[PDB]
C-alpha cells in the first residue's frame, strides 16, 4: 500500500517531490471530509523533549481529530528520564514497546534519526531536532502555499529575516527547489545571511535566486512573502536597532503586493509584522497555523494507515 | 510682511512666528518643544495652503522669542523653517535653522541596553553630519546611530 | 436554540438570573442521567496559564464525562508561549484554528475577555482571570446551595473570612443579589472587609445585609455558611494570630446550626475548618467539589450544544 | 466666535468649530483625539480671551463635521465647550458635549495587572455618573475607578 | 565607664532619653573631629542573614572609618550557616569567640536578642529583626532631625505612607515619644493605619496626634515630614492606584512649608516623592542617609570604648 | 594639582595621549617603589552589579595595596539594591555620601556615566559597562605593551578572535590610535569582524590596518598579538568548529616570531591559546594580568591625591 506507509518522517531531504504531493493531496481531503476514527485504538507518544507548545498542541489536536489516544510529556523537567547516564536510545527502546508511533522534538540534531534506530517497528516523527529539521512545519507551509497560490511551481518566493539561523526557512527552500521554476528573493541582515550551502545547492539545481536588502525591492514581484523573526540575542542591541527598522513588515508596505501575494510566518511574530498587516487580505499567518492541522493528520494517516481511503 | 489674512492666520505685535514648517511636522514641534505650555497667545495654522510647499504650517507665539539655540533644535524636524523675530508689527529678523552640536531631551536611544531608558536622565546626543545623513551618538551608551534610526525608534 | 448556545461564559455579571437557572436545570439533569458522548468529536483546549490543579482536573474530568477530547497546558513554565513579546491575543488567534472551545485561567484580569476578541467563532470559558471572575466556581456554589437548601431565594447566607480579597465570595454575592429576599451576614477581619462597591451594589438592590464580628452571632440564623481561608501573607504574622482564633470554624460551633445549615468552602481549607467539622452532617465542602462536575458539563453542554436533549 | 478683532478676517468656509474649551485643554483634544491626522486646514487659538472667560482654546477644523459621538467625547475635558457647525460662513448648528456612556481608547486603566496593557486592545470604560464623580469601569478587568484617577493615570 | 559600654543595642525601647542624647551627642563630635584609629585592632562581625545591602554598607563603612576590621556575610547563599538545622544560638556561640562585636540583621523577630543570650561578653548590635526593631536607623533619624531642627523636643512630625507595617515609623514615634511636647500628624490610607497600641501609647503620655486625609492639610505647621514607602503588594494592584495619588509628594505640594521643613524618607523611595522634590531645599533623605554613618559610628564608639575622650 | 585629580575615568575616549602616558607613567613608579599608606583612611566603594570576580579582585587588591578600606558587593543576590524599582541614580546618591571613590561594573551601557551625574564630588571609576567601555583594562593593556616593547608608538599590532563583539579590542584600537604610526592586522572570522566605525576611525587618521586569513601570515612582522575569546554561542555550535581551528594559537605557530613578540589575552582563555604556548617566552597574559594591579593603583593614586610626590 501507500508509499509513506510505515515510514519514518525525519528530514525533508528524504522526502521526494512526489511524497510531498501525496501528503498534500491527503491533507486537502481530510480538510474536506474529516475522518474522526481513522486512528481509533492507536496510541501515540507525544515526546516533547524540548517543549514547543504551539507545535505540541497542534500535533495533539491532529491526533485527536482522527480519534487517536495520546500519552507523552513536555519539557524535560517532569521527564525524570534525565538520570546521570539516561540515554535517549534506552528511552526510545522502552517507549517503542508501549506505542504505535512517536512524535518527538529534541534540543539536538538527529535525535529523531537516532530514535528510529531504536524504535523497532514503531515509526518515529520529527517535530523538530535542534537546528536541523522540522519536516512538519515545511509541509504545513507548502500546503498553505499551494492552497493560496494554486501551485508549488514557478513561484517567486520571498524569504525575509533570519536566513542564517532559521531552521524552517532552510527546509522551505529545500522543498521548493524540488519543484520547477521557483525564483527566490533573500532579504536579510548580512549578519544573518542565508548559508552558502543552501545557495550552493540551489545553483546545482540551476535555480535562479537573488539577495536583496529591503522588502520594498521585491514588494511587487512576490506571490509568497515568508517572514521570520530576527533573533535579537544573536545581535548587538544596537546593530539590531539599525537592522530592526529595516526588516519589519508594516501594511503600508503592502500597497504594492499583487492581489494573490500572501505573507506567511511560522509564528510567533513580535516586532517583524505589525498589527496593520493582520487586517489586510494579504495576511496569512494565522491561517497558516490552522493548516498545521491537516498537513499533520495527512502525514499521520498515511504513516500509520495502509490504505488511504478518502 | 505680506500678511494676507483675507481669512487665514493672524499676525501680532511682539513675538516669534515660526514659518514654513512642512506638513504634519508642526504638531510634532509643539509637542516635542512644549510650545503650548505658556500663558501666551500661541496661534497655530495647520495644513495652511502654500503652493510653494503644497501645504505648510505656521506657529505664531506672541510676545515670545526663541534663542539661536531653541531655533537650532528645529533642524531635524523643520530644517527650512524661517523663525521670525517680531516686536513691533513687522519683521525685525528672520532665522534659518542651523544644525546644532547636540540634541538633548527630545530624542530617545535606539540601543535598548542604554541605562538612559530607565533613569531620570534627559537624553543627549552629539550631532555629526556625515554624508547622506546625520549621525547621533548617545551621551551614555556612546553608540552612534543614523538620525533616521534615532527618529524612527 | 438554547440561550447560552455558542456564548462566551466570562463574567457572572453577564449572566442573568435565568441563565443561572438554565445552567442549574441542566446540571441537575446530567447528574441524573449522564450523557457520555454529547461532545463526541469536539476538541477542547484546557489552557491553564495560571495552574489550578483542583480546577484543571475538574473541568477536564467534565470534558471527559461527555466524551470530549482534551489538549492543553498547565503552568506557563512548559508553555514556551512566553517569548519576549508573545501576546495572549496572538496565542488565542492560533489556538482558535485548532479547537472547538477554550477553557482558560490567566493570572490577569480580563484576559479571558480579551481572549474572545481573538477567538473568532470559538467560545472561550473563564476558569479564572486574576482577582476578577471565576464564573464556574459560582455556578458550582449556587448548584450546591440550591441542591441543599431547595432554593436560591430568601436565604440567610453567611459569608466568612477574606471578604476583601476573595474572588469567589464577590461573585457569589453578585449571583445571590440576582435573586429575591436573601439576607447576608458578613463576618471578617476589618483588615480584610468586603468591598464597599459590593455593599454599595447591594443597597441599590434594596438588599438587607449585615457585618458581624464572630460566627457565633449568626450561628443560628444561617442556612448556608460560606467559608474562605484567611490569606495570612496579607497580614502581620501577629495580627493574623489575634485574627486567626476569631475566624476558624470548629464543630463545637455547630451545636446551634439549624439542621439544614450547610458549611461550604471553595477549598483548600487549612486553618479555617477543623477536622471535627468534617464528620458533622452540616459539613459540605467535599460534596461542593464533586458538584463542580455537573455544573461544569452543564455549562459545557449548553455552550457547545445547540439543543439541550435531556 | 471667529477672529474679527479690531478689523481682521479669519473665518472658515465650512466645518466644525470647537470653542469655549478650557485653557490648556485644546492641545489634549488635539492629540488625544488625534484631530491632527487630517489634511485639511486646521486653525487653533491658544489662550484667547472671551466674555465667558479671559482665556480659552479655540479650534476650527475646516470641512470636517464631528459626529455626535466625537462631540460627546469632549465631555470629560471641555464640557462647557460648544461645538458649532459652520457652512457658508455661518453657524448652521450649535451643540454641547453631553457626558457619554463609554469612553474609548484615550484613557488608561490604573490596574497594573490588567490584561489591557501589554496587549493590542483599545481601552474602553463603562462610564457612569455617581455621587462625587464619574466612575469609569474597565471593560477588561471590570474594575470601577474614579475618573479623577483614570485621567491622572 | 560610659553608660553604653559593652551593652547590646537591641531595642529602641531599651534606650532612655539620656542614652538617646548621648548617642546623638557623640555622633556630633565624630562628624566634626574623626577618630580613625579608635577601633584599630577591632574585628566586628557583620552578619546579614537578611540581605540589606543599604543598611550593611553604611554599618561597614562606619566600621572602617573607625579603624576596625570586618568579616561577615549577606543573604543565605553567601552563607553556608544553618542549612539542615544548625541553630542561630550555636552560630553565635561560635562567632562570639573570635570577633569583638556582632552586627546582625535577621528576617525573624527577636533574633538579635536571642543572640545576646549566647554571645557571652560580646556586644550584639541590631541592624534589624523583621517587623520588630531597628534602633540604629532611628538613631540616625533622630540625629538628622536634631541637626536640622536644632531640637528633639517640641516638634510637629507628619508621618505619611504605610503606617501599619512600617517598622521604622513605629520606632521613630516611640523615641520621639520620650521628648517633651511633640505633636503628630498621621497621614495614611485606611488600610495602612498606625496600629492602635502606638496610638494608645501616645494618648497615655499626654501626646497630641491627629489623623489627616492629605499631606496638604498640614504642610504649614510641619517641621519634619517623615515619608515611608507603600509596598503595593499590601494592596491589590488596583486598590493601590486609587489612594496612591493622595500620598505622593511633589514640589508643588511644598509651597506652604515652613523654612526649616524637611522631608525624610528611610529609603528606598519609588513614587511617593517626586524627583522634583530633590532640587527643593527641604529634601534631606540623602543627607539623612549620610548621617547614618555618624549615628552608627557613635554607637560602635560607645559600646567598645570604656571612655570616650572626645 | 595633577590633571587626573578628582576626575571620573569613564571612557578611554575621554583620556588624551597625555593622560594615557601619565597613567602609564605613575604605574611604573608604583611597581618600583610602593606607597602602602598613600590612601590610608580612604574608603572606596567596590560595586559590581555585573559579577566580574576577576576584574574585581584586582581592583580590590589594588585598593588594599594603597592602604584603602573597601566595602561593596557583587552580582545582584549579594545585593538587595534596586529590587522592585529603586533607581541607580538613587543608589549612587546614597552611596556617594559615605565612600571616597566608587568603582562599579554594570551590565547596561552608560551606567558609569549616569553615576557621575549623581555622585556629587565623589569620583566614579568604570570597571565595565556592558558592550561600551572598560578603560582600566585598556590602561593595563597599554602598560604591558609599553613595558614589554619599550614604546606605545610605532607598533605592529595583530588583533585576533571575536573582533566585532569584543569590547576590549575596540578600546585598545582607539588608545593605540592616539600614538604615531601604529599598523594593525585584524584576523577574524567573517562573522566576528572589527565593526566598521572603528575601521573608519583608523582610515581617517592615516592609520594602516589590513585583514588576514590566518595569524600565520603575519607572525613575522608582529610585535604584539592581542588574542580574544570567541564565545561559541555567537555562532551555531557547528559553525564554530569550521573556522575555529583557523584561530587557535599553538607553540608551533610561534616559530617565526620576532624576539620581542608577545602574545596578550584579557582572559579568560579557553581554546584559542594552547597550554604549550605558556612555556614559550612570548606568553605574557598572566604577567599582563599582574600589571593590572599597577595600572589600577596609578589611577586610584591620581584620582584621589592632589599631588603625587613620586
Ligand atoms: O444665527 C445664529 O446662529 C446667531 C448668530 N450668532 C452666531 O452664530 C455667533 P458664533 O460665531 O459665536 O457661533 C447671529 O445672530 O449673528
Ligand atoms: Zn544610549
Ligand atoms: Zn482594566
Coordinates of C-alpha atoms in Angstrom, one line a residue, chain B residues 3 5-11 24 27 30-31 34-49 55, chain D residues 3 5 8-13 24 27 30-31 35-49 55 89:
Chain B
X3 CA 0.2 89.1 5.9
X5 CA -5.1 87.3 6.2
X6 CA -8.1 87.6 4.0
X7 CA -9.2 84.6 6.2
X8 CA -6.1 82.6 7.1
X9 CA -3.9 83.0 10.2
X10 CA -3.2 86.1 12.3
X11 CA -0.3 88.5 12.8
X24 CA 2.4 67.4 9.8
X27 CA 2.3 69.3 15.6
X30 CA 4.6 72.0 19.6
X31 CA 4.6 68.6 21.2
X34 CA 6.1 72.1 24.6
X35 CA 5.3 75.4 22.9
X36 CA 1.8 75.1 24.3
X37 CA 2.7 75.4 27.9
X38 CA 2.7 79.2 28.2
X39 CA 0.1 81.8 29.2
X40 CA 1.0 83.4 25.8
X41 CA -1.2 83.5 22.8
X42 CA 0.1 80.9 20.5
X43 CA -1.9 80.6 17.4
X44 CA -1.4 77.6 15.0
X45 CA -2.3 77.3 11.4
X46 CA -2.2 73.6 10.2
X47 CA -2.0 72.4 6.6
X48 CA -2.1 76.1 5.7
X49 CA -2.2 76.1 1.9
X55 CA 0.6 72.9 2.4
Chain D
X3 CA -11.4 86.2 14.9
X5 CA -10.8 91.7 16.4
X8 CA -9.4 91.2 10.7
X9 CA -10.9 88.2 8.9
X10 CA -10.2 84.6 9.9
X11 CA -13.5 82.8 9.2
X12 CA -13.8 79.2 7.9
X13 CA -15.6 78.2 4.7
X24 CA -4.5 74.3 28.4
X27 CA -3.8 70.6 22.7
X30 CA -5.8 67.9 19.6
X31 CA -3.5 65.0 20.4
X35 CA -7.7 65.9 15.4
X36 CA -4.3 66.4 13.7
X37 CA -4.4 63.4 11.5
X38 CA -6.2 65.3 8.8
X39 CA -5.0 67.0 5.6
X40 CA -7.4 70.0 5.9
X41 CA -6.7 73.5 7.1
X42 CA -6.9 73.4 10.9
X43 CA -6.7 76.7 12.8
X44 CA -6.1 76.8 16.6
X45 CA -6.2 79.7 19.1
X46 CA -4.2 79.3 22.3
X47 CA -5.4 81.2 25.3
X48 CA -7.9 83.5 23.7
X49 CA -10.0 86.0 26.0
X55 CA -8.6 82.7 28.3
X89 CA -19.5 81.0 6.6

